[PDB]
Amino acid sequence: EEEEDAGLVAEAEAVAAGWMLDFLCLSLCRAFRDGRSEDFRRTRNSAEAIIHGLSSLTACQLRTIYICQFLTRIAAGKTLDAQFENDERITPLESALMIWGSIEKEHDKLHEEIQNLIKIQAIAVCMENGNFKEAEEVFERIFGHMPFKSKLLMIISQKDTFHSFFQHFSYNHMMEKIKSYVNYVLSEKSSTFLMKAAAKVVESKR
Amino acid sequence: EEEEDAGLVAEAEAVAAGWMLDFLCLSLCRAFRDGRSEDFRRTRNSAEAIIHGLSSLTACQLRTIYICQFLTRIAAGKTLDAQFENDERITPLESALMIWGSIEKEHDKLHEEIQNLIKIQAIAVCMENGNFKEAEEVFERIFGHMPFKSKLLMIISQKDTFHSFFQHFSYNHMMEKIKSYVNYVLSEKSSTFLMKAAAKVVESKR
Numbered sequence: 025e026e027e028e029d030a031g032l033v034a035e036a037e038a039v040a041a042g043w044m045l046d047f048l049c050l051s052l053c054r055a056f057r058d059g060r061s062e063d064f065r066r067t068r069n070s071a072e073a074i075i076h077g078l079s080s081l082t083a084c085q086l087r088t089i090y091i092c093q094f095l096t097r098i099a100a101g102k103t104l105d106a107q108f109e110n111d112e113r114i115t116p117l118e119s120a121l122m123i124w125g126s127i128e129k130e131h132d133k134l135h136e137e138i139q140n141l142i143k144i145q146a147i148a149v150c151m152e153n154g155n156f157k158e159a160e161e162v163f164e165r166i167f168g169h170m171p172f173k174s175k176l177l178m179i180i181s182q183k184d185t186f187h188s189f190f191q192h193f194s195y196n197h198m199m200e201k202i203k204s205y206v207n208y209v210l211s212e213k214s215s216t217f218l219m220k221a222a223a224k225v226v227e228s229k230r
Numbered sequence: 231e232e233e234e235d236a237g238l239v240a241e242a243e244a245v246a247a248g249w250m251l252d253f254l255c256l257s258l259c260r261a262f263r264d265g266r267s268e269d270f271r272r273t274r275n276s277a278e279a280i281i282h283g284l285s286s287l288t289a290c291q292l293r294t295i296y297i298c299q300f301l302t303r304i305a306a307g308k309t310l311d312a313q314f315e316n317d318e319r320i321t322p323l324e325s326a327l328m329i330w331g332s333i334e335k336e337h338d339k340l341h342e343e344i345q346n347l348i349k350i351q352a353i354a355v356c357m358e359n360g361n362f363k364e365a366e367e368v369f370e371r372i373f374g375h376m377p378f379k380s381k382l383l384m385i386i387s388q389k390d391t392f393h394s395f396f397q398h399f400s401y402n403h404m405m406e407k408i409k410s411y412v413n414y415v416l417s418e419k420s421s422t423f424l425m426k427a428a429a430k431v432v433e434s435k436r
Contacts, residue, residue, distance in 0.1 A: 030264075032432055037257055039428035044250050051243055058236075063283075070279040077272045221423070222245035226238055 041078050042085065047218040048074060049088045050210065056095045057206045068096055087128060091209065094123040098142075098202055101195070102149055104158075115162055117146035134205060140169070141198035147176055148190040156183050247284050248291065253424040254280060255294045256416065262301045263412045274302055293334060297415065300329040304348075304408055307401070308355055310364075321368055323352035340411060346375070347404035353382055354396040362389050 048071040055064035097120035100106040108119040150159035254277040261270035303326035306312040314325040356365035
C-alpha cells in the first residue's frame with residue numbers, strides 16, 4: 025500500500041504525460057501549417073521538456089515525434105548555423121531528408137516530391153549565402169535523379185545563386201507541399217483526448 | 231468560420247494548457263514531498279515551458295505558481311550561486327521568504343515556524359561556506375524576534391559555523407516542516423482533471 029500507492033501515482037503521471045505529448049505534437053503540426061512561428065517555437069520547447077519526463081513511448085508516439093523533428097529542421101532550413109546531428113557538417117535540410125526517408129509512411133507521389141524539393145533547397149540555401157564549397161559537399165552527400173543531378177552540379181560550378189531553377193522549385197513551394205502533408209496528418213489525427221475534452225468545454229460556453 | 235474556427239482551436243489549446251499547468255504544479259509538489267529531486271527538476275522545466283505558452287492565468291493558478299516558486303528556491307537554498315532576483319545579492323532562501331510572506335494563505339502557527347526556520351537557515355548556509363560578511367548582510371536585510379535576533383548576530387560575530395543553534399533549527403527541520411505543508415496542500419488539491427482521468431485509466435487495468 026505504501027510502495028503500491030506510489031506506483032499507482034507514477035502510472036497515472038505516465039498516462040497524463042502521454043496525453044500531454046500527443047496534444048503538444050498536434051498543436052506543433054497546427055502551428056507549422058498556419059505559419060505561427062512563435063507558437064511553434066514555444067510549443068516545441070514544451071514538447072521537448074515533456075519528452076524528458078517520460079520513460080516509455082508507443083510506436084505511434086515515436087513516429088509522431090519523428091515527424092515533429094522533421095518540421096523543426098525544415099523551419100531551421102535557412103539557419104545553416106543550426107546543428108541537429110553529431111556531424112556538424114550536416115545541414116538542417118539534410119537532417120530533415122534523413123528523417124523523411126526513415127519515417128514509416130506511404131512513399132506516395134507527395135512523399136517523393138517533398139524529398140526532391142528538400143534536396144534542391146539543401147543546395148540553394150548554401151548558394152544563397154555564398155557557401156558554394158559547402159553546396160558541393162551537400163551535393164556529394166545527396167547526389168552520390170540523373171537529369172536534375174547534372175543541372176544542380178552545373179549551377180554550383182557556375183556559382184549562379186539567383187538561378188531560375190531554384191525560383192521554380194523554391195523554398196516556398198517546398199513549404200507549401202510540406203503544409204499539405206501536415207493538414208492530411210491532422211485530418212487523420214484520430215482526435216487526442218486533451219483536445220476533445222477542451223473543445224467540449226469551449227462549446228459548452230457558446 | 232475561418233477566423234471563428236481558428237479562435238475556437240486557440241480557446242481549446244488554452245483550456246488544455248491550463249489543465250497541463252495544474253497537473254504539473256501538483257506533480258512538482260508531490261516530487262518535493264517525496265524527495266524525488268530529479269523528478270522535481272524535470273517537472274519544473276516542463277511547468278516553466280508550459281507557463282510560457284499561456285497568456286491568461288486565474289488567481290488560483292497564479293497562487294499555485296507562487297508556492298511552486300517557493301519550493302524551487304528552498305530546493306536551491308544551499309546553492310548560494312543561484313540568483314532568482316534582479317538583485318544578485320538576494321540569496322535563494324531570502325527570495326523564498328519574500329514569496330512566503332506574499333502568498334495569500336492563513337498565517338497559522340506552521341506558517342510562522344516555517345518563516346522563522348527559513349530566516350535562521352538563510353544565515354546558516356552563508357556561515358557554513360565561510361561567507362561570514364554575506365551572513366551579516368543577510369541578517370541586516372532580515373533582522374532590520376528580539377531573543378533570536380541577538381543570538382544570531384553573536385554567532386555571526388563569533389564566526390561559529392558549527393554552532394549548536396543551527397543544528398537544533400537545522401536545514402532538515404526546515405525541510406520537514408515545509409513537507410508537512412505540501413502534504414496538506416495536496417490533500418486539499420481538489421483533484422486536477424488530468425490526474426483524475428489518468429488514475430481512472432490505471433484502475434481500469436487492475
